[PDB]
Symmetry: D2
Subunit: 329 residues, 4 copies
């Protein structure tokens, strides 16, 4: 009659149910699942949201993971296909289906992509008025813009996902030759997320000492610092002898990391380059922006890119825009 | 002219500064400092608040700790003596000066205490309209009520602090004889926080098996299960051959733990016993209440206390109220 | 000539490279990948080992995950197919290929399994002399024995994996009806890991109060407490409308949790039931054993199983052994 | 007869009790207590050791803290006054009594210090053959040497404590003016730990861009970058209007952080400067050394200190040695 009830009574007060911190995920699967595994075990949102047009998977996904539900502590995990559930989320991220096939054409992914991605737009924005969007979906930089202009949430609240991992692998491969690790070995590569991403090796140092200096100069010869980068670009390629990426999931987790908590750190991502170098026509690509509480702490960090590198960044924008131009909106 | 500025520019967006998760502390020192050390390194509040009538200490306190500021990550730590700073906090806790002197009279602490504590009231409540109050201050149970009725925030949002540690030490001393630890060894002692706290050994078990059962019956003879408890009460006493308590700080941290995050777990604390056992006259003491987001998830858990124990709890209320009656409001 | 070198010199001391805490994984994939994601982001082993006969995947696996390598901190992650790399690990776990196909016959998995699993044996044991083995592989209970007797490491160091999650989902589904969660809601189900797993509801309680008591009696009628369990068994089934399990990975992580650290907590697993209830013939199944540093802290916890339940456990052993008997060693 | 026993039986195996990861603390109190609070709640050692000639305090200390024992998870905490308990520890740290009195003479602390510190030596070394020593005790740099030469453990295993916090406060105060925080704002100050500590502002940058550059040049005028540093030195001073330091405890925690785990990161500390700049006579002071598993990963990082700064470091060594010379061994 009141079993659960008689063991657990209430008080005369009654501050009704509610919540506070929200997390929403689009695309229950690899990128998603990986993200979920990362953000869900790390601990962030009061309640998390998963939503797809794959009834089946989600059940199994939301349910089983929920299983562990108990190995850590979150509260609630929701699923569905009507972007009704979330209504009011801070940390929102999307992916979608369209992954590289060994062979290239990551850019091709532009045509076949807007199809589904577009519609996602009206849904995710309407209910997440106070939400910030992170896109793990292909074409970190590119797709970002579409939704943004599409939705038109003031920049700072919109984040693509782009060049986050770029660095890490770069920073990481880096420590191997050093005998120190990704940690202190701070190495930077900034662009947009695909073979060609300019590298700013001029920012190579350890501790309080600048690297180039220690060695002197660079790539055009040397021992192929050149290579380091390329297979950062190439990185994508081989791996999928495994089929895809199933856990760069940390990067995305880190990215929103700053956001949700609101700490103001300097990290890659994709914003708007309109009055900077050559690029002058909204070229949402990979660039330092600083993030925080429901916004990208409105600060894009300016640095002096060596010309070699300098143009490289401008370059990207140039090559990048080609694809949008077509529009197919 | 714009040094910091030229390195760090902004965007055309501009979601002005603000924040989200708040923590406020009263009494920069042991209990406080310990709490701070606990809550601040554990990671919870976006920004933390410290406030006392000890200008000096606080500087050194807020400043130095702030020092580490960098060994973990919070954002901002504020100090002052005008309860203006916090304006709008969720997790608020108070202590105050008045600690036991080897010899007893923890209750004496009632007269000399309301003096300062009272005034604290108007201040902390006026600005923390949406805040919940945890009292590490002496007389967990007792003092609680004063402010509450004083302020009159609907129960669920007001928490004393009382019998939290009671259990742990009890649960803890417990594992020593077992060869398992506080973890799984779930042992309960519930009352109000001072020598006399009734113990409900009937709730002694491990895994899925009830203890008493395994041994059979109990204290009146045995090997002094009796003792276990008493020096749980006594616990206070000796230690101060060290002067006081400088780190039960976890208990308080745990207590609010449920709160801030809002998870709904079952833990001791001090509420209102008005229509339960004998006690019928607002006897805010040590009892299970379940806590959550800006409220004590309005549920006090009912259990069948053996008569021996049964009365013991009623008892406490009886002996406890003596002190208030006098009022001196 | 000495670039990396001139930036980083050494001292006259020289305590050569080495390490300390080791983790080894068999089966780079779901269970594995999930485990890895769990144990690797949680933080445990100084260095981790992955090893399969799937050159490709592992590259992509070890490499990419390694990618994040930098989002947390471990040190080294190794891969190969010669069980040479690990030589000397504490926390070793295996899975293998052979997952349920919607339809049942998890037991069928016995024939098709020993084929590959057997050989794994000589390899993993020869080099991990001081290692403990956890089997996420199908037939938690069953397979366990094979290797064990096979290897013959003294019990306490051998753990199957079996009924870990059993509980959690049970404990978990549990909190839904309560309004409290897996946390405090301690609910037990112990057996071996497949439809039929006996449940000991007699161990149903919250706080310090026993449940059955609160409601009184049980299943044979009621509101189907019966069901709760079955789809704990069924749990497996549906989900794979997703294909399999991709993240119960926590359970395994938790399981070794106690181990690696060596804390002595009470948890399910699979050991040897030889002189307990009816079972008398080495029936390695799901049962409480307590785990710790390179051993299962040699303690299996005895409790009084209601007859209804009582036999149920005995039962399992009976039905379980059928499969081994055949031997096919 | 076997109460605890009958609930918890053992197995025929029996891998006797033991342990693995060890932590030892000298000076139960502020620095110590703070450390303990940090290292003990953070989670590191299997078992921790506290040891003093203050029977009383320790009881209360070890006991009460132990209290929380249950709010996190370690295993065992030991106390005594015979350096017998630890026998075999990795992470060992000492402090001792002799703190600054508002007025200066931190160096005076040399005479009054060796008295007690000396004897500590034979004890702590004899039993911690495989232990590394961190000195939170005054004169980070100075005292370090005494014990070292005293004990003579090969450098890499001996760490003073010196300039750790130096940076943080420096790095930290830093972010205030920036609008980013200690995190990314990597700012370096390296010397020995007392007013005069040279600063290498030439290593001022954010992201991948060097600072000085952005502003151009420096201190001799400017807006007092000079000041920033000095009250880094001064930092010590005022605070003690609070009596001392009660929680820089993180720095020490971080310092050993690298050690215990063995990760190889670049951090301040005190080593031996014998064949570097001017200093040529064992001047154990504040300098980057890289730390790891039971050793300071034998690497001291070389960088080009501007002359202004250049000499400053040499300088320190010069002024520093004065005090030892006297010897009073
Ligand atoms: N942007 C980046 O920095 C970055 C980094 C990693 C991966 N990725 C992107 O993420 C992808 C992940 O590939 P994968 O192999 O792991 O999985 P997958 O592409 O096969 O699965 C895609 C999933 O996206 C979600 N999705 C797709 N269509 C959707 C729709 N209309 N509505 C809502 N959700 C929908 C669903 O969860 C779906 O199962 C890559 O191929 C790439 O597009 C991007
Ligand atoms: N309630 C409980 O469960 C529980 C458990 C532990 C300790 N305690 C209480 O906490 C005390 C801590 O003692 P201690 O030795 O650690 O330190 P302490 O009593 O000497 O310092 C008390 C501090 O309380 C704060 N305080 C005092 N007067 C105040 C005022 N008017 N406004 C604002 N803040 C004020 C200040 O930070 C002050 O320095 C105990 O004596 C007891 O009262 C209670
Ligand atoms: N024991 C339990 O409690 C429990 C719980 C969850 C899942 N599981 C088991 O784990 C399986 C995971 O299935 P999945 O779909 O996630 O992945 P999967 O079965 O398709 O991949 C199996 C993987 O096991 C490893 N493996 C297989 N053969 C091996 C060999 N000869 N040497 C070394 N490693 C080898 C490889 O990493 C391989 O890719 C389930 O089907 C079941 O067998 C068991
Ligand atoms: N080296 C550094 O980087 C650094 C940074 C912070 C503080 N400190 C040092 O730490 C001190 C801490 O001062 P405090 O006010 O916090 O506390 P305190 O000086 O009053 O207490 C000192 C404690 O050191 C231990 N100790 C002293 N004599 C000892 C002996 N013979 N054997 C074993 N242990 C003994 C005891 O725990 C004792 O209570 C400072 O004054 C300074 O010496 C150094």
């Amino acid at each position: 009659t009141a079993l659960k009830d008689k063991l657990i009574g209430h008080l005369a007060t009654s501050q009704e149910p509610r919540s506070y911190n929200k997390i929403t995920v689009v695309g229950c699967d690899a990128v998603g699942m990986a993200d979920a595994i990362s953000v869900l075990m790390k601990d962030l949102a009061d309640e998390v949201a998963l939503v797809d047009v794959m009834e089946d998977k989600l059940k199994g996904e939301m349910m089983d993971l929920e299983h562990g539900s108990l190995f850590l502590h979150t509260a609630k995990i929701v699923s569905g296909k009507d972007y009704s559930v979330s209504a009011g989320s801070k940390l929102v991220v999307i992916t979608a289906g369209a992954r590289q096939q060994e062979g290239e054409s990551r850019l091709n992914l532009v045509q076949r992509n807007v199809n589904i991605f577009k519609f996602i737009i009206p849904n995710i924005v309407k209910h997440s008025p106070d939400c910030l969007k992170e896109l793990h979906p292909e074409l970190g930089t590119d797709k970002n813009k579409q939704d943004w202009k599409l939705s038109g949430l003031p920049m700072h609240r919109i984040i693509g996902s782009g060049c986050n991992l770029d660095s890490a692998r770069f920073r990481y491969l880096m420590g191997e030759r050093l005998g120190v690790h990704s940690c202190l070995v701070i190495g930077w590569v900034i662009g947009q997320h695909g073979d060609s991403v300019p590298s700013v090796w001029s920012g190579m140092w350890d501790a309080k000492l600048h690297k180039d200096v220690v060695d002197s100069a660079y790539e055009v010869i040397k021992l192929k610092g050149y290579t380091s980068w390329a297979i950062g670009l190439v990185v994508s390629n081989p791996v999928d002898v495994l089929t895809y990426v199933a856990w760069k999931g940390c990067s995305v987790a880190d990215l929103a990391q700053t956001i949700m908590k609101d700490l103001c750190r300097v990290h890659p991502v994709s914003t708007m380059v309109k009055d900077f170098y050559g690029i002058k026509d909204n070229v949402f690509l990979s660039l330092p922006c600083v993030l925080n509480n429901g916004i990208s702490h409105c600060n894009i960090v300016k640095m002096k890119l060596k010309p070699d590198e300098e143009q490289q960044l401008q370059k990207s924008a140039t090559t990048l825009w080609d694809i949008q131009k077509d529009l197919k909106f």
